[PDB]
Design a protein around this ligand. Sequence first.
Ligand SMILES: CC1=CN[C@@H](NC(=O)[C@H]2CSCN2C(=O)c2ccc(C)o2)S1
Lengths: 327, 826, 248
Amino acid sequence: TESDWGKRCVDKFDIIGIIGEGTYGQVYKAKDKDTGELVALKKVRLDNEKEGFPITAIREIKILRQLIHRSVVNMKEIVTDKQDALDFKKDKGAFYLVFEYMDHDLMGLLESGLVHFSEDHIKSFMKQLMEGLEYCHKKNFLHRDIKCSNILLNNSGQIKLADFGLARLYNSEESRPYTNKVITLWYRPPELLLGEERYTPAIDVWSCGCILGELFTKKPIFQANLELAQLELISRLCGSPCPAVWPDVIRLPYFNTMKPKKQYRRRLREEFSFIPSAALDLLDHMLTLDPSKRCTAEQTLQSDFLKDVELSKMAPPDLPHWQDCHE
Amino acid sequence: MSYNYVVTAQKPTAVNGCVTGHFTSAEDLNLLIAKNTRLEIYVVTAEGLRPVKEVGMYGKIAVMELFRPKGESKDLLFILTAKYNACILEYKQSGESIDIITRAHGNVQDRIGRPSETGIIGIIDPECRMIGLRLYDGLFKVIPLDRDNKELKAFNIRLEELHVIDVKFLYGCQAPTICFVYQDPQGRHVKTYEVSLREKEFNKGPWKQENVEAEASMVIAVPEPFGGAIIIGQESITYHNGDKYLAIAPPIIKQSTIVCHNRVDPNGSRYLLGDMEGRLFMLLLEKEEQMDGTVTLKDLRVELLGETSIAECLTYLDNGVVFVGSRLGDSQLVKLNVDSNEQGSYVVAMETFTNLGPIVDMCVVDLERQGQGQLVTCSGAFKEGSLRIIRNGQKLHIRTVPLYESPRKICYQEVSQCFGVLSSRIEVQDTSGGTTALRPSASTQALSSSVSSSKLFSSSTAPHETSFGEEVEVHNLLIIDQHTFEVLHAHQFLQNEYALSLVSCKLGKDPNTYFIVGTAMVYPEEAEPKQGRIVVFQYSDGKLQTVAEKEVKGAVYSMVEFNGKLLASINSTVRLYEWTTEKELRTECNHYNNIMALYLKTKGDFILVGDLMRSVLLLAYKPMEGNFEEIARDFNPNWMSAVEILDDDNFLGAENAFNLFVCQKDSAATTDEERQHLQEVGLFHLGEFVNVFCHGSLVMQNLGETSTPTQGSVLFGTVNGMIGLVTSLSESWYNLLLDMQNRLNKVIKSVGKIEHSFWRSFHTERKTEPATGFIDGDLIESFLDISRPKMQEVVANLQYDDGSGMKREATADDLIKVVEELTRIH
Amino acid sequence: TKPCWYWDKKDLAHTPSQLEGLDPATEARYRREGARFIFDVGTRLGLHYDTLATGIIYFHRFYMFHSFKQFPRYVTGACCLFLAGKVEETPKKCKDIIKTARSLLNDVQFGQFGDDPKEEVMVLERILLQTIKFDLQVEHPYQFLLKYAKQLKGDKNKIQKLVQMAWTFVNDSLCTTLSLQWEPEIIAVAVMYLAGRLCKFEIQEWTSKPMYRRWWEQFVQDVPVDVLEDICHQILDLYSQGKQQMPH
Ligand SMILES: CC1=CN[C@@H](NC(=O)[C@H]2CSCN2C(=O)c2ccc(C)o2)S1
């Protein structure tokens, strides 16, 4: 049957190329021979067998087994390499997770500095983003890192959230260490920087707020390589963490250890004065330092910006598939 | 892990901007011409221009204006770079010695802001009280010109109008105010706001707003006697001064967009306008004087003066001579005569300044058998299009072949002693239903000519209604003799067919040498072409013959000869064709992991594919199997302009952000993932868009001259005309020359006090990274021009590795020896 | 898109174990020992109760697809717990589970792990995942016993006695095939139903519908008393067979 995963072989999926690289495998673009649909294969190698099937892979398997929302990427099935039936003790074959293929990642499109996102485009984008995140948070599944590379969007306009586990970026040979982590920092919430705390839904919402601003500038709002220099950039914009705004900032371990250079006043509305009022009010609420004070996902969906956005009106984004010759 | 070396062989040749002011000599009017990273200062003479000085700047010159504050004897110079480096400069001439002074400097980049659509704009108050900058949507930055602002500190004023088109400081207003054309959903309007330095905000301007043409493009600041502002659009020119309103809509300017304006008269009665088709117009201001003696602008009149090169900027030398600076053509000094000549033109060309224009494509070919190498480049656009031949026999000899149409590509076919050149000309829908060319050009002046009769796409059954006055591109193939550069033949391609790729080669067991062209059916409705033709031509006995045609489902962006087979890229697919004994193309194998496969290069069985958004892919043709296989892909998202293979392991790529980068293999590292990863070992902001990468050099080597530490030769061309060269180094020589750069930067004084390390840092709008794996050869070659005291200061405490002696030191004379040898590679 | 994890009592007469000559009593015994082995092992390691149950559910389901004669039960149990730890985010290193398993098993029992215990377990995780069809999500009666108890209002002490007594029955159900027979929502009602009878409580009084004598129908729709009576009977047969008696 279709519900019985783990028995079909990868021999049913023609491989087109390696779209991404992962810590425990590679990500290949492929076509199912029978269906004709384009899929994405995520390789999980348990051949080291140090501590078994990766827990990160298990997280993506558990969460996305039961999540089918339009705004989240869906796992179709899990296939295996050719396996000898004599014994599975002998077999060390890898397992591949089938996903719906996505055309572009938000990071790629903005890296051009050529694509233009109008207000309506951002509305369509953010509403899908938040609708998916609500569905996940309601199911008590939280995406601990929401990045720009994690946001996958096809040419039509649909937005999907991906990389709950088994991220699709790999660092090899000599390069900046943990480059993927450097990107993750740009969207990390202040609470996590200040302390380990517990994983809260707010950690998702802050990252999505960072994205919101990035869509109005085409540049990440906060870019830094060290946790202290990131906290300072946040403070220059959102204001330094203090009890006056954060009644529980003291409880965090590094509130006194990590300190912004000065105590800054909040300038978010001034440095973003070029953003529409309906949106700016959303940014201000999504970038509140305190997790409890930070707005929830449902509340974002009931914002002026996103409440009255028409889901039917997809309004595709304008992506340049011509004039790449230029001039 | 890889080490390369980049030098300029020809500096930028394209006029980005031009302003005239009393800079060098407070007495004498000085013309300042700007090219990318390069500033040239001249002095007006009754015969032409006398060059005073040429300086190099770290940064793309974005703003250039000459202003004199109260208390200064001579006009000062303000410049802002594309990376937001600002500075104020002053000429100092201690007799023979010339020195450009950095009076103030700073970086005005904002941590948060949206880059504006119409680009950076810089204007200065007539009272020279402040500098106005429009860097981001919805923000207006102000640098107050106070004596104490040596760091150029600035503040932002919130601007309600987000989408601004152009803004100029008005003349004669009591309080400094800005007149800006802006675009909101209701059209475009002209609005003015007063700027307060004390309050640091906007106050209400004289006229709140007025509804202007939808394509209002330029704002003219009319001088104090007239007052107000002039707005230039596509069909209409208007004058706004409060209650006063003038509208002039001659039917001559509707034919071509006007892109440049200049103040012929200090009083402002005369203004200069230039359109895309090169025509030069004079804006005439008619003055009616009120009875109390005040002056009202009675009418606006536009007169056709003649034809110039497509003018990016225009400036007046006050001798009846206008300097026409062009980025698409050769710049010129023209003379405006009061009396027209026998053809009706008031314009006569004086001098012609060579512009290598946009180098769309170039090929290296030893035409004169010298066993040296000559470079023929596709240069220019529209009527300024041309073919340029360059040789290194100190100056580079450039011969210009006028085409009068845009040249897309070039490839040399020795068997036919001729070049193949793709070109496109502009025709306009005429009353006959067909089209008419605005001027004769190469594809119409051919000795023999042919028009494609292919019926592959005849049954379109698709709607493409023609409106009179619309432009279309007619793409042609041009056969051109290598000695006389005479246009021997022209093949007009099908209607709406664009020629994108060209190759000359034999295929399979076929002894005939063919011209092969890849095309695309371009319809305005399509986001990405979905039809295309691969056409095989044979030039024989003064005639081009169609040997075969292969239909494809997309655009054939790039082709290349691949071991007797034809490798082509159709949209996302990369395909390998075989040439059958029946003289037809047959598909062998395909590869589809691409978004858009714009560029293709090969070496042996290896192929470098340059995807539009996913950088470069190393592919290989596995012969045993007859399939393509992916060796390694760079997973960085850098956009691609052109690509080149350096060696079996190193690959060069040019970003659309003007950043060169090099990717190497992991040399069969144990992990399969590492093998499939292309590490970006080299990063380097070049500052120029590279359309074409080519191998070879123009240096004459009688016979295996060698004697150069540098290994390899890669020549590239840019939009602003630069012809650079990339080559590889050994580890030892890289470290030596890198260590020398760090020493040179401490010693050499930069214009505007711009850090060299910052200037060459890899800069995308999002991520900025230190440059690695590249030696700024232009910095190294400057060691020969610094004074002896600085030479010895550089070589002090020198250290050597892997040398003749593993640890050694070199003197000021020892380094001079190396640099002079490094100057001989170009 | 998700598989059916529930069989009929009558179907248990046709597990691979039964068909290889194993009698019903023996499989039932093997099930108890495996479940308690998982329960005891994880308890020594300090694991959340959900992680214990999840491992036990993997265990019970596993032997609906395989025979006890060809897969030693304690190895399977250890593997189930090992995977359960990673699923429920309470991970443990395989070597630590082996360490604990050795402390609690005698020399004969630990023989099932063979010469390399860790290897025999890690190798089985490949099969376990394919057997459970990669449906790693398992709800348990615990969350429903609390979600439903929260809606009860009345004597704090009588309701708390009901909960703990029911909770004890949930733990006791993990040793029997009920987990493969009836969904967890029904089990949490069944245990409430059982504790109510033993404590002489009339639960309806604590509901928002105090005169709705079938109080559970507002928690779980379409459940006949027939089911609750069977679920309860099986839970209490364990106590009768064992020397242990009802908690009360
Ligand atoms: C899970 C997933 C489902 N779809 C996915 N989408 C992708 O992998 C997209 C967006 S990130 C790059 N990418 C590509 O298609 C790609 C890589 C390389 C080349 C040529 O294209 S990952």
